[PDB]
Structures are given as structure tokens and as C-alpha cells.
């Protein structure tokens, strides 16, 4: 900090960052072991003058760190279900981001790479190698050495890098049997080699690929994953958890309680909410962790560009299920006089529209809601 | 890829409407949507391959055995069913359904499946049936039944519970296969 | 030539003039399908033609085409494999120059567009 | 496709540049520019195949008769050369350009060639040669001395014509061939 009146003391703090990380992932730390840092951080801080508060919220930084990365750990061998685990390094996938130390990100954004890589979820090994690609650019300078990938370290001209991260991810959506996001990219990855490398024979392979995909698209059929809503309520869950909702991309042929069943597996506490539709109040607070789940309707996407063409079926099909960030689920409902001849005297649909952050498919097989709302439909409509 | 005919017939009173519904639906128990058309279908993956299949979801009236038989031919298994809480139903299938049915397509699996599981254990219920003299009737004599024809399974589930339900629809798909 | 003519034509569909619809084959014929075989039979003398450049920079449209209005993917797809064919072609063998003369003609008896005229002769590769 | 050295000599009164770069710029008689630099190359077919071929010039000194061998090697065609309007080049033809290649690499195909044949029955250059008692010596024994050495053609042409200077490259490649 002597230092500091010319210049900083940002690098220490941030090889102290790395580092703390790589232990504290590693398998080390402790939980009082971050109290009494902050504690004394703090104590010397007051000892020192004016720089104190920086310093101090940089520990908080360290802080924040730590508790996220112990509960990593105390998840991660606590629960030793791959898919809390996801969740967990999403977390501090997320967290770093905002935390901007892109690095350590990029790394742990390969660490569920792998993971995914080991579950077939080929689609989300491929986006968020994708999200990794997103970094890199265009142009020719290999210009930072943090966003040199683990497998080898030298140069990489990050026009070469890129390229062969599109290599992969096509790869990827090709036995991921999702090829428009293939072509899209395969788009730019020949629009590149033509227009700065010029690289023909690139050129001839890639497309050649593209050909493959266009046939393997209109020539098939694709199942649909059913679309499963999740709401975890009562007072038990990780904080992440409790009353919250969630919507799941389940497999293809999936049956509602098929997708019950696995959940509880996951779960101790295995009892369920029966209103499905509401949240409970009581166990908006009450302990004894409940869910409730069921199946709801994957709003069609609005396929750009294609408003009114002749557009056949097979392109329909796919947008049908995928690229999907609304959703509903149609409520039967009495409202009127209940003849017994008849059950539309009174049926009123009270749909709740399900907005989430992202769209499927994507990084995770599943995510949260961003955002609900209900409907009230008359049996003239 | 492929696809299966499926018939359901049953007693009128019961409208195993709600049971197909609930079941393709997959909506929650006792919160199904009720259509305005018969005839149902659901594309399941039973083992391995994915397999199409629609029921034809039929008016059980007597009267409407004369459209019925024109759709028997090609019924890849038959869905014979009943009220475990309705004797009256035994009466129905035993008598006419289970014989006439057994007559018109006497070789192909057929599967008889319960039904109000939960209202066949319903107090209330079955002390109304003895205040009106209808036994509840139980699973083991049902099974009695079943051997009566020798049937290749049988079942029961509960549209209020789904009970079953799920594998009642299992044995019916891998029976064919 | 043949593209002078196509360049006459629209990516639209409605047969809006029979004249174009000569009397080799005729029958209904929308523009669309006019316009898509002569950039096919375009693309087919210009590779044959031993020349490439033109022709990826016609079938970019042809594809394009394709894609946004009849999605026609296995013809997508064999287009774009013939592309493939031809960026190999640029990239693989050189092809032989062509010699460029001058001519001008001066006098009375030629053609009075050819009297005393100039003209430039792209002449066969190696004469 | 294929590359071919090609050499050429003469005396250092005949510029035989002028014929290798007023014929390879197939340019008009006399409107050409005289560059600087030697050994040419050129890439001009004959028939079939396009081939390419290489342009050894060396100038019409005596010294350099040692660098010169070890230019001859893997010339699959050497080419010699004279001036039909100059007796003393004859007699230095047959003193130091034929002996020395012949010495050097006895074994290559080989091709004697006149030279301002437009200037050999020029008039006035023929009284000029005589007044200064030099031949304007004619193809019969120019034929002869090629017949000595059996060149396998003998030929003779101009550059200020460019007649036959086309046939002289013509049968020069297909020499090789």
C-alpha cells in the first residue's frame, strides 16, 4: 500500500484470490477459518487509516468466497448427486462473473464442462463451451494468457482458438442431434475462414458438415423432452431452494411421476405438495421441505423470419419444443351453475404464464422462473 | 417407430372418459381437462423404442353395439372394464360385455382393469352399498374373475390417484409387445 | 448469356409473363422454377467452364433461395457439396492464363460498326 | 506440367537476347524493351501439354567458359546459335561455342540455328560484308557443318521479322520432345 500511493495493490489480491481458491476447491479450508479472517482483517484495518473500508470490502469479496466455495464442498459431498453439483458450480459460475475475475470463471465454466461431458448432456457441454467461446474474438492476437484453455498453454492465435472451440461445439450439437444451432455456427466458422484465413479446405469440410446437417434436419424425427414445473417450499431447503419454482427439461418420454419419483430420489423429506397449482403460506415459513410437481405446456417459440412462409414440418416440429422461455398450464375450474349433463357450464381456465430467465435448451437441464402470472378463460373461449 | 389400436369399453355410469383423459392429459388427479371429443390417444416410449397408440375411447350403450364391431378388427389388445364399487358393473361385464367381446374377438389379449380403487375403500361408500345392499366387492374374487376367463392380466387403478394407473397403461402397452 | 437472361427474372413466384416461357419446354412453370434452373444449368456450365469464382457467388443465392422460401434441404444439401467441390478446384489445380491481344481495325471495307475500330481479343490461353 | 533448362550461346557481336526476349513478350518487331538481366525462362506449350521451360543466357565472353559448365549440367537442351551474316563468327562458332559444349556435355540434344537471315540477302549488307571481304555465307554449308555435327536441326531466322523465330521455338521445344 506504500506501493500503492503509486499504483495498487490490486495484483496481490488478486493472485491471493487464485490461489485461495485453488486451496479452498481443493479440499482445505475452514468455516471459522473465514471468520477469524475477516475478524482480524477487520481489526488491522482499524489499526490502519482511510484504506481500511477498501480493504475491508475487498475481504468481503474474500468472504463471499469462501462461504460460497464451503458450501460448494458441503453440498458437493453432502448430497453427491451430480446435479446439486451443477447447480453449485453454476452458482460460483455465476458469482465469479459478477465478481469479474474471468479466469477462475473460465475455469470452473470447464470444470462443468466435464461434467456435463460426462452425462451425455451434449447440448450443455456445447453451450457452455460456447459461453467460453463467446470470450475469445475474432481477431488474430493471442493478446491475455488467462484464456488459454488447461489442455496445452502456448499462443494460440485466439483466431485458431476459436476455431477450434467451434470444431468441438459442432461436434457436440452433431451427437447432441440439435444441428441448427450447428449451422448457425457453422456460419460463422466458414464466413471466417473465407473472409481472414482463407483457409479453403476448411471451407470444403465445414460445409460439407452443413450439408450432412440440413439432411439429418428435414429428414428425421426428433422426440420432445416433456416440461416439468418444480416448486420447492417449507423451511429445510438450501437457501436456493425454498419457495422458489423451477421448470425442468426432463427427457422425451418422461411420464409427470416417472419425473416425481427421480426428484424425490434426490430428496430426503419426501412429501409432497397436493394443491398443485398454489404455493402454501404456512409452508412459507414451516419447516419439512415440500415440493410439488407437474407437467405444463411449452409456449410455441415465434420463429423469426418465418411469419407466414410455406414452412414445412419439420422446422415447426423443432421450434415447437426448443428456444422456449414461456409456458402456461390451463386450469380447470368451476364457475357458474354445475350441470350435471354437461362440464362447460362453468369452466374457467385460470393459465399461469411461466416467463424464465433463459431458454432451453441450455446450460442446465433445468433453471428457475423468473416470473409467473395467472389467466381466467370463459368457456365461450 | 410405430403405433398400436387400443379399444376401452366400460359401464356408462363410471365414464372411464376420466381415466384416459387424466392418463394422456398427465395433468394432476382429480384436476383433468374434460374435452368434448372420444377417441384418445398418447405417443409412449414403453422399452426401449418409443411406440404411437391411440384408444378407441367407445359409447358403451348396448345400442351402440352395432357401430362398435366395425372397429374390431385390428384391435391390437382390448381394455375391458368396470366399477370395483359397482356390482352392478360386475353385472354389466360378466354378462354382456366380458361374453359379446370375448365372441367378437376371442383371440387377442385382453386385460379387465378396477376402477374407484379408493372409493372400493370409501366407509362412507360401502355403507352406502350395504344400506342399499351392493357388496364392496374386493380385489380377490375380481382376480376370481379374471381366471374365470383366464384373462392375460388384470388390474385396478384410481383416477383420483393415478394409482397404478401408470402401470395399468404399462402391462397394456408391452402386452402387445 | 444464359444469366444476361436470367437476370430478366425474380426470386417471386407468380408466372406474371409466358413470354419468357419459350418453346423449348413449356408448361406451368412459375418464375420461381424458371429462375432456380437456369442458375442450376448457370452453375453447371461455369464449374464445367472450368471456372469457380462466379460460380460460388451465383450458388450463394441459389442456397439463400432455397433456404428462405422452398427449403428444399436435400437440394441444399447437394448445392452446397458441389460448393465444396469448387473451393477444393480454387485452392487445388491452376488453370492456364489467357492471352490478351489489341485489334484495331482501320480502313474502309470492313463493317461500318467495324471500320476503323479497336478491339480487344481474349484470346485461347496459350496462343 | 514440367520445367525445362534450355541453354543458349554466341558470340558477343549478335545480342541473342534480343531473339529469347522479343520472342517470349511475343512482342512486335522492334518494340521491345532491351532489359539488363539474363537467363530468361518461359512457360509457352507446344501441343498437348502446356510446358515451362527455363532460359539459360550467358553473353559471348571467352573467360566465362568456367562458369558456363557448370551451368551445362541437366540441360536436357543446350541450343547453339550464330549469325549467318558474319564469317568470323563462324569460324568462332566452330572454335569455341561448338567445341567446348560439344567437350563439356557431349550428350544432350542439340540445335544449330542461323541468324538475321532478313539481313543475309540484304543488299546492302551483302556488299558490306564484301567490301570488307566477309561472305554473307549461305545454307548449303552452313547445312554442312551442321550435318558434321548432326545437330539434330538447323535453322535460321530474325528477330526484326520474328519469321520463323516461332518455328525456331517450336521445333526448339519439341527438341525435348
Given at each position: 500500500f506504500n506501493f500503492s500511493g503509486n499504483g495498487?495493490?490490486?495484483?496481490?489480491?488478486?493472485?491471493?484470490?487464485?490461489?485461495?481458491?485453488?486451496?479452498?476447491?481443493?479440499?482445505?479450508?475452514?468455516?471459522?477459518?473465514?471468520?477469524?479472517?475477516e475478524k482480524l482483517l477487520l481489526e488491522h484495518c482499524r489499526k490502519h487509516k482511510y484504506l481500511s473500508s477498501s480493504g475491508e470490502v475487498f475481504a468481503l469479496l474474500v468472504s463471499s468466497l469462501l462461504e460460497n466455495l464451503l458450501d460448494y464442498r458441503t453440498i458437493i459431498m453432502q448430497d453427491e448427486s451430480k446435479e446439486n453439483r451443477?447447480?453449485?458450480?453454476?452458482?460460483?459460475?455465476?458469482?465469479?462473473?459478477?465478481?469479474?475475475r474471468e479466469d477462475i470463471y473460465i475455469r470452473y465454466l470447464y470444470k462443468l464442462r466435464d461434467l456435463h461431458r460426462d452425462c451425455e448432456n451434449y447440448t450443455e457441454a456445447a453451450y457452455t463451451l460456447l459461453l467460453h467461446a463467446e470470450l475469445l474474438q475474432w481477431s488474430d492476437k493471442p493478446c491475455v494468457p488467462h484464456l488459454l484453455q488447461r489442455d496445452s498453454y502456448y499462443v494460440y492465435t485466439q483466431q485458431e482458438l476459436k476455431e477450434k472451440l467451434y470444431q468441438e461445439i459442432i461436434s457436440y450439437f452433431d451427437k447432441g442431434k440439435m444441428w441448427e444451432k450447428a449451422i448457425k455456427l457453422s456460419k460463422?466458422?466458414?464466413?471466417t475462414y473465407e473472409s481472414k484465413v482463407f483457409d479453403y479446405e476448411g471451407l470444403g469440410n465445414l460445409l460439407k458438415k452443413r450439408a450432412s446437417f440440413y439432411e439429418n434436419i428435414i429428414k428425421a424425427m426428433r422426440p420432445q423432452p416433456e416440461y416439468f414445473a418444480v416448486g420447492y417450499y417449507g423451511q429445510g431447503f438450501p437457501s436456493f431452494l425454498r419457495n422458489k419454482i423451477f421448470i425442468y427439461r426432463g427427457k422425451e418420454y418422461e411420464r409427470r411421476e416417472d419425473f416425481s419419483l427421480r426428484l424425490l430420489t434426490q430428496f430426503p423429506n419426501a412429501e409432497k405438495m397436493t394443491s398443485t397449482t398454489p404455493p402454501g403460506e404456512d409452508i412459507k415459513s414451516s419447516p419439512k421441505q415440500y415440493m410439488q410437481c407437474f407437467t405444463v405446456k411449452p409456449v410455441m417459440s415465434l420463429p423469426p423470419s418465418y411469419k407466414?412462409?410455406?414452412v414445412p414440418e419439420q422446422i415447426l416440429n423443432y421450434?415447437?419444443?426448443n428456444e422456449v422461455q414461456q409456458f402456461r398450464y390451463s386450469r380447470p375450474f368451476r364457475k357458474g351453475e354445475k350441470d350435471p349433463d354437461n362440464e362447460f357450464a362453468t369452466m374457467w381456465i385460470?393459465?399461469?404464464?411461466?416467463?424464465?430467465?433463459?431458454?432451453?435448451?441450455?446450460?442446465?437441464?433445468?433453471?428457475?422462473?423468473?416470473?409467473?402470472?395467472?389467466?381466467?378463460?370463459?368457456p365461450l373461449e | 417407430m410405430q403405433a398400436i389400436k387400443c379399444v376401452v369399453v366400460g359401464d356408462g355410469a363410471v365414464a372411464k372418459t376420466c381415466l384416459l383423459i387424466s392418463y394422456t392429459t398427465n395433468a394432476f388427479p382429480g384436476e383433468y381437462i374434460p374435452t368434448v371429443f372420444?377417441?384418445?390417444?398418447?405417443?409412449?416410449?414403453?422399452?426401449?423404442?418409443?411406440?404411437?397408440?391411440?384408444?378407441?375411447?367407445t359409447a358403451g350403450q348396448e345400442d351402440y353395439d352395432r357401430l362398435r364391431p366395425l372397429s374390431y378388427p385390428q384391435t391390437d389388445v382390448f381394455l375391458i372394464c368396470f366399477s370395483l364399487v359397482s356390482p352392478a358393473s360386475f353385472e354389466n361385464v360378466?354378462?354382456?360385455?366380458?361374453?359379446?367381446?370375448?365372441?367378437?374377438?376371442?383371440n387377442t389379449p385382453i386385460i379387465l382393469v378396477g376402477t374407484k380403487l379408493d372409493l372400493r375403500d370409501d366407509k362412507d361408500t360401502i355403507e352406502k352399498l350395504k344400506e342399499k345392499k351392493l357388496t364392496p366387492i374386493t380385489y380377490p374374487q375380481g382376480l376370481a374373475m379374471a381366471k374365470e376367463i383366464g384373462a392375460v392380466k388384470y388390474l385396478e387403478c384410481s383416477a383420483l390417484t393415478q394409482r397404478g394407473l401408470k402401470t395399468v397403461f404399462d402391462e397394456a402397452i408391452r402386452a402387445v409387445l
Amino acid at each position: 500500500f506504500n506501493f500503492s500511493g503509486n499504483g495498487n495493490f490490486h495484483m496481490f489480491e488478486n493472485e491471493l484470490i487464485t490461489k485461495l481458491d485453488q486451496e479452498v476447491e481443493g479440499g482445505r479450508g475452514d468455516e471459522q477459518y473465514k471468520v477469524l479472517l475477516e475478524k482480524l482483517l477487520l481489526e488491522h484495518c482499524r489499526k490502519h487509516k482511510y484504506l481500511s473500508s477498501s480493504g475491508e470490502v475487498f475481504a468481503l469479496l474474500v468472504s463471499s468466497l469462501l462461504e460460497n466455495l464451503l458450501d460448494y464442498r458441503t453440498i458437493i459431498m453432502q448430497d453427491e448427486s451430480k446435479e446439486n453439483r451443477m447447480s453449485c458450480t453454476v452458482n460460483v459460475l455465476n458469482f465469479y462473473k459478477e465478481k469479474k475475475r474471468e479466469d477462475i470463471y473460465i475455469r470452473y465454466l470447464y470444470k462443468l464442462r466435464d461434467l456435463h461431458r460426462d452425462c451425455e448432456n451434449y447440448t450443455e457441454a456445447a453451450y457452455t463451451l460456447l459461453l467460453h467461446a463467446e470470450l475469445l474474438q475474432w481477431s488474430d492476437k493471442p493478446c491475455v494468457p488467462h484464456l488459454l484453455q488447461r489442455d496445452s498453454y502456448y499462443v494460440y492465435t485466439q483466431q485458431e482458438l476459436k476455431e477450434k472451440l467451434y470444431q468441438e461445439i459442432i461436434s457436440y450439437f452433431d451427437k447432441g442431434k440439435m444441428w441448427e444451432k450447428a449451422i448457425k455456427l457453422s456460419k460463422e466458422l466458414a464466413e471466417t475462414y473465407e473472409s481472414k484465413v482463407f483457409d479453403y479446405e476448411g471451407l470444403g469440410n465445414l460445409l460439407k458438415k452443413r450439408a450432412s446437417f440440413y439432411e439429418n434436419i428435414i429428414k428425421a424425427m426428433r422426440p420432445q423432452p416433456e416440461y416439468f414445473a418444480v416448486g420447492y417450499y417449507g423451511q429445510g431447503f438450501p437457501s436456493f431452494l425454498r419457495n422458489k419454482i423451477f421448470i425442468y427439461r426432463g427427457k422425451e418420454y418422461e411420464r409427470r411421476e416417472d419425473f416425481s419419483l427421480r426428484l424425490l430420489t434426490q430428496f430426503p423429506n419426501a412429501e409432497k405438495m397436493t394443491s398443485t397449482t398454489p404455493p402454501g403460506e404456512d409452508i412459507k415459513s414451516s419447516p419439512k421441505q415440500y415440493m410439488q410437481c407437474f407437467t405444463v405446456k411449452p409456449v410455441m417459440s415465434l420463429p423469426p423470419s418465418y411469419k407466414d412462409k410455406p414452412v414445412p414440418e419439420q422446422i415447426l416440429n423443432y421450434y415447437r419444443a426448443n428456444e422456449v422461455q414461456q409456458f402456461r398450464y390451463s386450469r380447470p375450474f368451476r364457475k357458474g351453475e354445475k350441470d350435471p349433463d354437461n362440464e362447460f357450464a362453468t369452466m374457467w381456465i385460470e393459465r399461469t404464464t411461466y416467463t424464465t430467465a433463459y431458454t432451453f435448451p441450455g446450460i442446465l437441464k433445468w433453471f428457475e422462473v423468473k416470473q409467473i402470472s395467472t389467466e381466467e378463460i370463459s368457456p365461450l373461449e | 417407430m410405430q403405433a398400436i389400436k387400443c379399444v376401452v369399453v366400460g359401464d356408462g355410469a363410471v365414464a372411464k372418459t376420466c381415466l384416459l383423459i387424466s392418463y394422456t392429459t398427465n395433468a394432476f388427479p382429480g384436476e383433468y381437462i374434460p374435452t368434448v371429443f372420444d377417441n384418445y390417444s398418447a405417443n409412449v416410449m414403453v422399452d426401449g423404442k418409443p411406440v404411437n397408440l391411440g384408444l378407441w375411447d367407445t359409447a358403451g350403450q348396448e345400442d351402440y353395439d352395432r357401430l362398435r364391431p366395425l372397429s374390431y378388427p385390428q384391435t391390437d389388445v382390448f381394455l375391458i372394464c368396470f366399477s370395483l364399487v359397482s356390482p352392478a358393473s360386475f353385472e354389466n361385464v360378466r354378462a354382456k360385455w366380458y361374453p359379446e367381446v370375448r365372441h367378437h374377438c376371442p383371440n387377442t389379449p385382453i386385460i379387465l382393469v378396477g376402477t374407484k380403487l379408493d372409493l372400493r375403500d370409501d366407509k362412507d361408500t360401502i355403507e352406502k352399498l350395504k344400506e342399499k345392499k351392493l357388496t364392496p366387492i374386493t380385489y380377490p374374487q375380481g382376480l376370481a374373475m379374471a381366471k374365470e376367463i383366464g384373462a392375460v392380466k388384470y388390474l385396478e387403478c384410481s383416477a383420483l390417484t393415478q394409482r397404478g394407473l401408470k402401470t395399468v397403461f404399462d402391462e397394456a402397452i408391452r402386452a402387445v409387445l
